[PDB]
Amino acid sequence: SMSVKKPKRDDSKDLALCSMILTEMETHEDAWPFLLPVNLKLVPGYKKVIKKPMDFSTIREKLSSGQYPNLETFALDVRLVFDNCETFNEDDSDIGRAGHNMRKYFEKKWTDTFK
C-alpha cells in the first residue's frame, strides 16, 4: 500500500530472457503454424471466430518496440497463440498437435527461466 512495498524482484533481464524464449519457440520444428499471422482473406471462418489473432511474428514486433509492459503481458500473448489454435483446430490434426506441443515447450521454458 502507500509507502509499504514488497522487496524489489530484479526484472532488468526480463526483456532479454523473453527474447531468448521467443527465439527458441521460433526455431522449434512445430512452430510453422504460428510464425506468421493467419491470412484472414484466405482462411474462412478465422476473422469472425478468433477475436484476437496472435502469432510469433507479431509478438516479436511488440517485444522489439516496447509494447509489453511486463513479462506477464508477454506470456498472455504467447498463450493466446495456443488458445486460438485450440479454438480453431481439432486436437487430432497436424496443427492441433503442433499447438499442444508448443504450449508444453513454452510452459517449461517459462517455469525454468522465471519460477
UniProtKB/Swiss-Prot annotation:
It comes from the Eukaryota. Residues 9-113 form the Bromo domain. Expressed at varying levels in several tissues, whereas a smaller transcript was expressed specifically in testis. It is found in: Nucleus. Belongs to the WAL family. Regulatory subunit of the ATP-dependent BRF-1 and BRF-5 ISWI chromatin remodeling complexes, which form ordered nucleosome arrays on chromatin and facilitate access to DNA during DNA-templated processes such as DNA replication, transcription, and repair. Both complexes regulate the spacing of nucleosomes along the chromatin and have the ability to slide mononucleosomes to the center of a DNA template. The BRF-1 ISWI chromatin remodeling complex has a lower ATP hydrolysis rate than the BRF-5 ISWI chromatin remodeling complex. Component of the BRF-1 ISWI chromatin remodeling complex, at least composed of SMARCA1 and BAZ2B, which regulates the spacing of histone octamers on the DNA template to facilitate access to DNA. Within the BRF-1 ISWI chromatin remodeling complex interacts with SMARCA1; the interaction is direct. Component of the BRF-5 ISWI chromatin remodeling complex, at least composed of SMARCA5/SNF2H and BAZ2B, which regulates the spacing of histone octamers on the DNA template to facilitate access to DNA. This is Bromodomain adjacent to zinc finger domain protein 2B. It comes from Homo sapiens (Human). The lineage of its organism: Eukaryota, Metazoa, Chordata, Craniata, Vertebrata. The gene is BAZ2B. The chain holds residues 2054 to 2166 of 2168 of the full protein.
